Design an enzyme around this catalytic site. Structure first.
Site, mmCIF file in Angstrom:
data_model
loop_
_atom_site.group_PDB
_atom_site.id
_atom_site.type_symbol
_atom_site.label_atom_id
_atom_site.label_comp_id
_atom_site.label_asym_id
_atom_site.label_seq_id
_atom_site.Cartn_x
_atom_site.Cartn_y
_atom_site.Cartn_z
ATOM 1 N N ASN A 1 0.839 -1.217 0.000
ATOM 2 C CA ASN A 1 0.000 0.000 0.000
ATOM 3 C C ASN A 1 0.867 1.257 0.000
ATOM 4 O O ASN A 1 1.956 1.300 0.611
ATOM 5 C CB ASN A 1 -0.987 0.010 1.169
ATOM 6 N N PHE B 1 -1.623 8.407 4.026
ATOM 7 C CA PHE B 1 -2.374 9.055 5.133
ATOM 8 C C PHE B 1 -3.596 9.794 4.587
ATOM 9 O O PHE B 1 -3.837 10.985 4.911
ATOM 10 C CB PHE B 1 -1.526 10.038 5.954
ATOM 11 N N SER C 1 5.403 5.367 8.846
ATOM 12 C CA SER C 1 4.798 5.207 7.505
ATOM 13 C C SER C 1 5.898 5.309 6.455
ATOM 14 O O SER C 1 6.665 6.272 6.453
ATOM 15 C CB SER C 1 3.747 6.221 7.202
ATOM 16 N N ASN D 1 5.163 6.044 3.431
ATOM 17 C CA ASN D 1 4.408 6.706 2.334
ATOM 18 C C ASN D 1 4.234 8.207 2.570
ATOM 19 O O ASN D 1 3.471 8.823 1.802
ATOM 20 C CB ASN D 1 3.059 6.005 2.156
ATOM 21 N N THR D 2 4.947 8.786 3.544
ATOM 22 C CA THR D 2 5.012 10.255 3.771
ATOM 23 C C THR D 2 6.489 10.646 3.762
ATOM 24 O O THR D 2 7.242 10.106 4.594
ATOM 25 C CB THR D 2 4.263 10.667 5.046
ATOM 26 N N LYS E 1 5.335 3.816 17.221
ATOM 27 C CA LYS E 1 5.293 2.727 16.227
ATOM 28 C C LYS E 1 6.488 2.875 15.295
ATOM 29 O O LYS E 1 6.650 3.934 14.670
ATOM 30 C CB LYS E 1 3.987 2.739 15.444
ATOM 31 N N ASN F 1 5.570 -1.412 11.666
ATOM 32 C CA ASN F 1 4.902 -0.941 10.440
ATOM 33 C C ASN F 1 5.284 -1.847 9.252
ATOM 34 O O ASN F 1 5.999 -2.866 9.401
ATOM 35 C CB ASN F 1 5.230 0.536 10.198
HETATM 36 C C1 FMN Z 1 -3.706 -0.834 3.658
HETATM 37 C C2 FMN Z 1 -2.844 -0.565 4.864
HETATM 38 C C3 FMN Z 1 -2.868 0.674 5.467
HETATM 39 C C4 FMN Z 1 -2.118 0.957 6.621
HETATM 40 N N1 FMN Z 1 -2.208 2.203 7.195
HETATM 41 C C5 FMN Z 1 -1.573 2.389 8.357
HETATM 42 C C6 FMN Z 1 -1.715 3.622 9.057
HETATM 43 O O1 FMN Z 1 -2.506 4.531 8.718
HETATM 44 N N2 FMN Z 1 -1.019 3.745 10.234
HETATM 45 C C7 FMN Z 1 -0.175 2.776 10.733
HETATM 46 O O2 FMN Z 1 0.432 3.009 11.807
HETATM 47 N N3 FMN Z 1 -0.022 1.615 10.096
HETATM 48 C C8 FMN Z 1 -0.692 1.426 8.969
HETATM 49 N N4 FMN Z 1 -0.566 0.216 8.324
HETATM 50 C C9 FMN Z 1 0.335 -0.809 8.884
HETATM 51 C C10 FMN Z 1 -0.360 -1.843 9.736
HETATM 52 O O3 FMN Z 1 -0.907 -1.250 10.920
HETATM 53 C C11 FMN Z 1 0.609 -2.942 10.166
HETATM 54 O O4 FMN Z 1 1.638 -2.326 10.965
HETATM 55 C C12 FMN Z 1 1.245 -3.722 9.006
HETATM 56 O O5 FMN Z 1 0.342 -3.838 7.902
HETATM 57 C C13 FMN Z 1 1.742 -5.089 9.420
HETATM 58 O O6 FMN Z 1 0.672 -5.941 9.900
HETATM 59 P P1 FMN Z 1 -0.030 -7.020 8.904
HETATM 60 O O7 FMN Z 1 1.085 -7.795 8.226
HETATM 61 O O8 FMN Z 1 -0.854 -7.868 9.857
HETATM 62 O O9 FMN Z 1 -0.909 -6.229 7.935
HETATM 63 C C14 FMN Z 1 -1.318 -0.067 7.172
HETATM 64 C C15 FMN Z 1 -1.302 -1.317 6.537
HETATM 65 C C16 FMN Z 1 -2.081 -1.594 5.441
HETATM 66 C C17 FMN Z 1 -2.043 -2.979 4.849
HETATM 67 O O1 ORO Z 2 -1.320 5.693 4.900
HETATM 68 C C1 ORO Z 2 -0.457 4.903 4.518
HETATM 69 O O2 ORO Z 2 0.058 4.883 3.379
HETATM 70 C C2 ORO Z 2 0.205 4.030 5.535
HETATM 71 C C3 ORO Z 2 0.594 4.489 6.757
HETATM 72 C C4 ORO Z 2 1.393 3.659 7.613
HETATM 73 O O3 ORO Z 2 1.807 3.987 8.726
HETATM 74 N N1 ORO Z 2 1.741 2.442 7.079
HETATM 75 C C5 ORO Z 2 1.383 1.956 5.850
HETATM 76 O O4 ORO Z 2 1.752 0.855 5.453
HETATM 77 N N2 ORO Z 2 0.638 2.818 5.086
#
Ligand code: FMN
Ligand code: ORO
Ligand code: A1A4N
Ligand code: CL
Ligand code: CL
Ligand code: CL
Ligand code: CL
Ligand code: CL
Ligand code: CL
Ligand code: CL
Ligand code: CL
Length: 366
Positions: free
Chosen positions: A115, A119, A185, A187-188, A225, A254
């Site tokens: 992804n 944000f 993140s 992505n910022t 985080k 993350n």
């Molecule tokens: C589509 C998507 C969006 C995410 N957006 C955020 C976010 O806004 N803030 C954040 O701290 N982590 C974000 N993450 C990271 C997840 O919270 C997590 O740390 C990461 O995906 C690893 O866990 P997983 O393998 O179970 O998905 C995002 C992950 C995914 C897949």
């Molecule tokens: O908004 C996102 O792109 C996002 C935020 C974050 O903390 N981690 C991630 O995988 N995506």
């Protein structure tokens, strides 16, 4: 295995994912969840899954990671799935659109996602009003062992990162059991540089002063985080700052900007953060190193590639007090939550642990 687990994993989720773009699938999931259109969570939480950490009781140690419910639209439905705790966000101070679409990519051959949402956020004001509408319902859920976390981000065009996080503490701190300073993140632009020692100490000092200024019943725990892509020096520096300032916990990890050897998905070279199975062991080993560097004195929420009780217990034994998942829910659907809890309970019994608490950091004592 329940009928629902097999039907969702083998038939329903592959069929729905085959009919929908990935972001459309995400949006529909938030809709179904907010409406309570969910299979029965058959699993009854046992005493051996209860964890006391971060000033709260957690009925079970399995949470929904940030990113699923960015805007706090589906909190009650996520408890109805059987999550022991819910984390919303990231939330940015001002509303912002995020990156252009497409910005989320399925790698089913890898049980992974990439992804680059960037944000996308309704902003603090909208989320504040959405949480205020259910503030006393949440107080009763928290008292019943179902706490709420709020993950804070920063706006793309902000000049003062620390002021964005301070604004999040001010506005959503009073509605949260814990806050997350998301400095990881991928992505910022420039966000991950806030993990550096000098920048992190300044940022976290400001965040903690803001938190300490809230009235006692409205004063959340503060967690940081972190990325899975840190140098050894970066991890040593984060551990030093967390202990110096009395940060309440860490969320580890993350998504990764690495592309491990062996990825098969056609979309493996898309820009963004990789989640799911290929992240799992890189996350577990980050938990292990952060637990050791903090002498087991700093609670860790372990996240990255959890889709089974074994995955959860490996993170707990490495040093996690709690775990989260997101990506597994994209492949398995809602029954994955009961699946992980049932498998975790069975493994704790098989390995001679009285409960989750006895297993936390157990690998470090071998
Ligand atoms: C589509 C998507 C969006 C995410 N957006 C955020 C976010 O806004 N803030 C954040 O701290 N982590 C974000 N993450 C990271 C997840 O919270 C997590 O740390 C990461 O995906 C690893 O866990 P997983 O393998 O179970 O998905 C995002 C992950 C995914 C897949
Ligand atoms: O908004 C996102 O792109 C996002 C935020 C974050 O903390 N981690 C991630 O995988 N995506
Ligand atoms: C990473 C973005 N992303 C993707 C794409 O990578 N998928 N995804 C997702 C989709 C779904 C879907 C849709 C397939 C309709 N449905 N359901 C469901 C099924 C039946 C009943 C009740 C629900 C909520 C889920 O649980 C569910 C969870 C999810 F994480 C999600 O957040
Ligand atoms: Cl506690
Ligand atoms: Cl895709
Ligand atoms: Cl307002
Ligand atoms: Cl308030
Ligand atoms: Cl403090
Ligand atoms: Cl290194
Ligand atoms: Cl790489
Ligand atoms: Cl990238």
């Amino acid at each position: 295995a329940t009928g629902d687990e097999r039907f969702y994993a083998e038939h329903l989720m592959p069929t729905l994912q085959g009919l929908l773009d990935p972001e459309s699938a995400h949006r529909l999931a938030v809709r179904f969840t907010s409406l309570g259109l969910l299979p029965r969570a058959r699993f009854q939480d046992s005493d051996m899954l209860e964890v006391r950490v971060l000033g709260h009781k957690f009925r079970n140690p399995v949470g929904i990671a940030a990113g699923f419910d960015k805007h706090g639209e589906a909190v009650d439905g996520l408890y109805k799935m059987g999550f022991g705790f819910v984390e919303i966000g990231s939330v940015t101070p001002k509303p912002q659109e995020g990156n252009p679409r497409p910005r989320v990519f399925r790698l089913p051959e890898d049980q992974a996602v990439i992804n680059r949402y960037g944000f996308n956020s309704h902003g603090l004001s909208v989320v504040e009003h959405r949480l205020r509408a259910r503030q006393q319902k949440q107080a009763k859920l928290t008292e019943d062992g179902l706490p709420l976390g709020v993950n804070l981000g920063k706006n793309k065009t902000s000049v003062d990162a620390a002021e964005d996080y301070a604004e999040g503490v001010r506005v959503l701190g009073p509605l949260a059991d814990y806050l997350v300073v998301n400095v990881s993140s991928p992505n910022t632009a420039g966000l991950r540089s806030l993990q550096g020692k000098a920048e992190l100490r300044r940022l976290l000092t400001k965040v903690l002063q803001e938190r300490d200024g809230l009235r006692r019943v409205h004063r959340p725990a503060v967690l940081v985080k972190i990325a899975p892509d840190l140098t050894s020096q970066d991890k040593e520096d984060i551990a030093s700052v967390v202990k110096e300032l009395g940060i309440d916990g860490l969320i580890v990890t993350n998504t990764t900007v690495s592309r491990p050897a062996g990825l098969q998905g056609a979309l493996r070279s898309e820009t963004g953060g990789l989640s799911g199975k290929p992240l799992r062991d890189l996350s577990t080993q980050t938990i292990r190193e952060m637990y050791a560097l903090t002498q087991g004195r700093v609670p860790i929420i372990g996240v990255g590639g959890v889709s089974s009780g074994q995955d959860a217990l490996e993170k707990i034994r490495a040093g996690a007090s709690l775990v989260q998942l997101y990506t597994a829910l994209t492949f398995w659907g809602p029954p994955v939550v009961g699946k992980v809890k049932r498998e975790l309970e069975a493994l704790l019994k098989e390995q001679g642990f009285g409960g989750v608490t006895d297993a936390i950091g157990a690998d470090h004592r071998r």
